[PDB]
């Protein structure tokens, strides 16, 4: 009595019909460049994987991007040099430049094109009922495209999009956890940022697909509609669950949780309780009102859904009605 068995209904054998070459990044071989090229300007953000500054390429004065990696398994960074590599020239995928060495950590450094961008936090407080529709239409562009080449980024939020606004430039960035999708195989679930995390991953599901990126994509859309950023702000992650259902009910995770026989861990009995199904128009005021629209409403409900196989794919919901105004241009 395990979990009942789930595949991807797009792109389901992308990676079965292609080389092996294509998705064995393990056996990839790194070509690398000439670190000399570069010099660090700016340290703009450090990680727990990583260190990223604004570099220049001395050799044209370019204004570029370098990610240095800290030591971590050549493996893990070979798939997202690869997915990178595969990806490039993509719609809305951040471009992978270059790779060297880095001299002083003894680590690769990943360099990418740079993108003048302007920080969510306060970028998503100026943003118009237009600009949103536009920005999530591009959002879909770069996910459809790499989930039609076999790969789920898993770690969509707002500070991985990456937005040079003035010209309405965006970027779905850092691939660190993206991997490629094999029909029956069981990913890990700690993948993902707390808040954007899908029920799939929340109750340990791990035959999950490409589905996983419109529920974090969802997530997004809702803490920009309704100006609540995270819209799911859990303490932790079964907290986290505990959050989605009090707003998506408990009747239809439940619902959820038989269909696919998923066993709920026994912390998580007396913490999800019994919840209604609120209406979006409850999270609708006079400060966020001017984003909302019957269009958004309907077409986040149809990225909020607790099964993963009900989810719009980022192709469907490219032809939802709340993006006419984009398509028209
Ligand atoms: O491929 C990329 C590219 C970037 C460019 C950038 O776009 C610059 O700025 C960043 C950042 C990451 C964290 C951070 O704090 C920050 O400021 C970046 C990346 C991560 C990636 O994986």
């Known amino acids: 009595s395990g979990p009942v068995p789930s ?31 570069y010099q660090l300007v700016r340290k703009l953000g450090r990680g727990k994987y990583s260190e990223v500054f604004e570099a220049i390429n001395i050799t044209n004065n370019e204004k570029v991007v370098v990610k240095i990696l800290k030591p971590v398994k050549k493996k893990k960074i070979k798939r ?79 500070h991985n999009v990456m937005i040079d606004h003035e010209h309405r430039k965006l970027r779905l960035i850092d691939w660190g956890l993206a991997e490629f999708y094999h029909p029956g195989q069981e990913y890990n679930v700690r993948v993902a940022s707390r808040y954007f ?10 035959m ?14 809702a803490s920009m509609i309704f100006r609540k950023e995270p819209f799911f ?11 989605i259902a009090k707003v998506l009910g408990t009747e239809d995770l439940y619902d959820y949780i038989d269909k696919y026989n998923i066993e709920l861990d026994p912390r998580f009995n007396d913490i999800l309780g019994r919840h209604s ?41 490219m032809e939802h009605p709340y993006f006419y105004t984009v398509v028209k241009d």
Request: net charge negative.
């Open 80 to 158: 997202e040099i690869k997915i990178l590599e595969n990806l490039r020239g993509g719609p809305n995928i951040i471009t992978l430049a270059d790779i060297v060495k880095d001299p002083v950590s003894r680590t690769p450094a990943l360099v990418f094109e740079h993108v003048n961008n302007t920080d969510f936090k306060q970028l998503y407080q100026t943003l118009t009922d237009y600009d949103i529709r536009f920005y999530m239409y591009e959002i879909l562009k770069a996910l459809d495209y790499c989930h039609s080449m076999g790969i789920m980024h898993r770690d969509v939020k707002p």
């Open 7 to 37: 595949r991807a209904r797009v792109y389901t054998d992308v990676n079965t019909h292609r080389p092996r070459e294509y998705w064995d990044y393990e056996s990839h071989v790194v070509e690398w460049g000439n670190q000399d090229d």
């Open 197 to 206: 995390k899908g029920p799939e991953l929340l109750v340990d599901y791990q």
């Open 277 to 317: 199904r609120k209406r979006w128009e409850r999270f609708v005021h006079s400060e966020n009102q001017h984003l909302v629209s019957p269009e958004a409403l309907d077409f986040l409900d149809k990225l909020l859904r607790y099964d993963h196989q009900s989810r719009l794919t980022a192709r469907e919901a």
């Open 233 to 243: 702000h859990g303490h932790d992650n079964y907290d986290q669950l505990v959050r």
């Open 208 to 221: 999950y697909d490409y589905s996983l990126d419109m529920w974090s994509l969802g997530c997004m859309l």
